[PDB]
Design a protein around this ligand. Sequence first.
Ligand SMILES: [K+]
Ligand SMILES: [K+]
Ligand SMILES: [Mg+2]
Ligand SMILES: [Mg+2]
Ligand SMILES: [Mg+2]
Ligand SMILES: [Mg+2]
Ligand SMILES: [Mg+2]
Ligand SMILES: [Mg+2]
Ligand SMILES: [Mg+2]
Ligand SMILES: [Mg+2]
Ligand SMILES: [Mg+2]
Ligand SMILES: [Mg+2]
Ligand SMILES: [Mg+2]
Ligand SMILES: [Mg+2]
Ligand SMILES: [Mg+2]
Ligand SMILES: [Mg+2]
Lengths: 74, 195, 54, 39, 242, 50, 48
Amino acid sequence: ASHRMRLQDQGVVVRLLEDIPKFGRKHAIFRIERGRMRNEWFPKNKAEYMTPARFQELGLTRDAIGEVDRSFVI
Amino acid sequence: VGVIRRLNVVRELLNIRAGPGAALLPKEVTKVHMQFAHRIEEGHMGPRKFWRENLPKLKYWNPAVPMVINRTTDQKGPAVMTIYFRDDKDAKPSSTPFPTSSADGSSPAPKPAQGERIVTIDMKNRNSSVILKEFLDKTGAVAVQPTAKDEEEFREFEDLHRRSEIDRERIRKMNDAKKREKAMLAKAMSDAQSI
Amino acid sequence: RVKGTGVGEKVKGHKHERTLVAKMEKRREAMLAMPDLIREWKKVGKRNWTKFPK
Amino acid sequence: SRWDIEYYRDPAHRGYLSHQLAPGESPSLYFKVPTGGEK
Amino acid sequence: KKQYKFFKSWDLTGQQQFSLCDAMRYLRAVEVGQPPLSVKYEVHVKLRTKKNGPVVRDRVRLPTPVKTDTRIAVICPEGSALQEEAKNLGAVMAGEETLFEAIRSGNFPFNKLLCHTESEGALRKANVGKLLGPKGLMPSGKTKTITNNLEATFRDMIGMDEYRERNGVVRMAVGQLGFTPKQLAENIRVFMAKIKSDIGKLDDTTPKMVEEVVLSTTHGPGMSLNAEFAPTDDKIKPEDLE
Amino acid sequence: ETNWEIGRLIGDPGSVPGTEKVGSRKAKFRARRRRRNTFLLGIKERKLAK
Amino acid sequence: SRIINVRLISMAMTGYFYTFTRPRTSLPMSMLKYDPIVRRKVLFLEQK
RNA sequence: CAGUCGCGUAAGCGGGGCAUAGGAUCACAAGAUACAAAAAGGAAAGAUCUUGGAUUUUUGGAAAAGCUACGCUAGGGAUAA
RNA sequence: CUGAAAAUUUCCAGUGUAAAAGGUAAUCGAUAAGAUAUAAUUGAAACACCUUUAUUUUUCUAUCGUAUUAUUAAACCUUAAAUUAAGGAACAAUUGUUAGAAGACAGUUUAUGCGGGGCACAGGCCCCAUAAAGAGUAAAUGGGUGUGUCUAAAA
RNA sequence: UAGAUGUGCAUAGUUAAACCGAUCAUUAAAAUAAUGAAUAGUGUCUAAAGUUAGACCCGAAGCCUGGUGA
RNA sequence: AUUCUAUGAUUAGUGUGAACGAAAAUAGAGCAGCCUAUUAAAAUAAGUAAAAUGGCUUUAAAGCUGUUUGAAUAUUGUGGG
Ligand SMILES: [K+]
Ligand SMILES: [K+]
Ligand SMILES: [Mg+2]
Ligand SMILES: [Mg+2]
Ligand SMILES: [Mg+2]
Ligand SMILES: [Mg+2]
Ligand SMILES: [Mg+2]
Ligand SMILES: [Mg+2]
Ligand SMILES: [Mg+2]
Ligand SMILES: [Mg+2]
Ligand SMILES: [Mg+2]
Ligand SMILES: [Mg+2]
Ligand SMILES: [Mg+2]
Ligand SMILES: [Mg+2]
Ligand SMILES: [Mg+2]
Ligand SMILES: [Mg+2]
């Protein structure tokens, strides 16, 4: 333990659009590694970045951010 | 010896509060007395299991009633138990004199007071079951039911014994295999080394 | 309405002022035990003494 | 400031804030006049 | 290959501690019918101490005695304040008639007998001097068995309890099975204080602090002790019995 | 409370409280005799009792 | 290293102290000294 | 002189040792003082007093190895052949 | 020494591979017999059983760390107008941070005193003489095994 | 017409410093107990000066930056 | 509001030293305010403020900045100092 630790990035909030297996169902919000979203999901249109503007249009709030479900299978 | 070691060994031995023989006796009862032999012969195995299996479950829910035992070496002694059921409609008599447990019959069954009426129950060559039911039906008492957490306690430790017995034989198979191998070599080199 | 001197505010006092009473009470507590402490010292002896401060 | 207020708050200096004090109150904003007696 | 200079100290965050009254409820059930005179409690106190440091070898004179080697029986007027006071001191028997008939049976549950200044006459009238003579239990002033003060003598003939630290723990009895929670309670406070007093009396290099307090019987499970004293269950209340 | 007055609570200056013999040597002699008298007289009664 | 400088602290809890030298293989110092804060002679004991 | 302790019948003596051989500031550390406190209440960092750790030994107190015959400049003959 | 389950602890003697201490006189055996233990023997220490601790060793879990494998399945890199190609591959490469490290390179220091300088040696303080009857008084002057100490006082 | 306005120095000392003040500071409380410190300044000219600037004048070898030349 | 000159100031302050060195305010020169800017611009500002770390500046603040991280919504007390 210590009063100061190495600053890390938890991830980027995204909302799925294709019901990716092993990660979550469609329209599921959670934090995922920036590499997978930037290189795999976003190009294939599998998810979308959840910006503060995107939250307003969808009527959601920061309380909807869930977690990845490695047990999910379509 | 970790804290969880001692913890699992305890919570398992805390079956005193369980279904087998636990029950909330009524306030009508005042005290209990029992007398049996040390060994199991001439019909004396019944009371022993009743003393080690179901009797402890009563003092937990009934810690106010004194339950005393009087053992003896006379194997032919009458394995009989008395129940001071009547308390004179809860008149609260002054039953000050009362003996204490022993092992040589030094504390026999005393005579009840004026406001007390004992209830005799014989037990000889009879199983604890028939002896137990005879205690509840006669001494009308409500049986306490266990909680869901208690069901998990039984289920957990039950599944634990599966892993334990699975390991008891395993480690046993490694030691004997070693004690056997260490001998085969001893008969080869240590046998000729004597010269 | 500034801190300390404003309406309703209360001055905090410097550390040597807040602990002034507790400071003098500790010295008074010690002098009252001075006679009994010197008797024990002059009785036990300078060599056998072991109750030293820390 | 604390010092400046306490200065003009006591009658010894004839401070123009001394009228805010009670006959038994002290000019200091922290210290108080202790009470004498057996208690 | 590796080595440590300390005794293993486990994490107590998940331990399940019990109050003194709630604990005796579990123990008194396992010892149903067992001879209370041959079943005594015991306490194991784990200490956060270093292996190189010294050990504790002091003694403690508990309020109530636990060792049943010297069973003392007094002779006081029946129903007198000394009768109950005698039990509060550690007396196994206190009475005239109950003792006269007990000795006349041929079996003596005790090994020593006393006679108070108030029951001097009734002693010789019982016609028992011919009984205690051979066994050497004849209460006489020569043996200092006749006294007006009881607690003043109970502290010498009985003795003092001994305790020793072997390996990061101290084991010693604290009370018999028949001890009431009120008597057993103070019997423990006297033991913890005498320890904490000896620790502070020791050096300040490595003050040995207590970690946990266990309680068990001669045939009971080792249960943890909570500083609390009263039962958590509101239905149960302090109850004393055999 | 001034520190010098806190020092004069134990006693007036000129002496060091705790250094002056509280008991008189003559009194210690009188007590030493009484204790011896009771001891000798104690044996008297115990001898007379026997 | 043979000699050490010790500090004798006033037992009046005034915070006054005296400093003296004494060998390491010697018992700690303890003396009756004058305390200028209370203006009386009190007991002074070594710090450690 | 004030303060308050010791010894002594007393007068009186005592602010280490028969005398002559142990370095500061700064920084740092431990106690006290109640001085100031960058809007204000506190604090931090400062100030005053006491005290401690030095081959600071080039000891009025720099953290510091050589070659030049490839040599250069300013000077001295205030010191050589 | 993250924790669980289980098990293991051999100098001679000793019924035998005694882990240690505290406590125990009883425990086990579905109803008939006997096995344990206490006793007695051995030893410095004597055993069941209930506890609480110590040493060591397996599996499991947890944490670290290496090792390998896959990746148009569009990280990145290489060839390639630059591709649903080939290969490498979570390495490499680069950025930041951290540690080590070449007089390879840079700045500076290496002094002063001395019957010339170099080499060597010397640098504070104390006592005596030189010192000429106050004090002071020099020299690579002469004496000295001089000195960076000791000392809380009592049993 | 009137009002205000424009550095500074001195006029009170004392202490590390404030409070304080013809008194102040040390004395861990204070107190003629002791010791130290109290009374014409300001501006200008003439001249001689300290300080910082080239600083009374002349004189290096060398160091750094930018350019020039095979 | 900005800019220029003088005073403030061999000051506060920094630095072991050698030295380095403000601002408020004052005086003078000029004077001008605006977003519909007298030339054509904002829907009032997020990888920003800020933090850790490496540096610059510097009095430790403020200000500049590479790397890794990363806020709030207005005196009905939100944000900076
Ligand atoms: K002045
Ligand atoms: K700030
Ligand atoms: Mg990452
Ligand atoms: Mg402030
Ligand atoms: Mg010099
Ligand atoms: Mg000199
Ligand atoms: Mg040559
Ligand atoms: Mg490949
Ligand atoms: Mg070089
Ligand atoms: Mg002369
Ligand atoms: Mg002369
Ligand atoms: Mg300055
Ligand atoms: Mg804005
Ligand atoms: Mg910034
Ligand atoms: Mg900053
Ligand atoms: Mg800012």
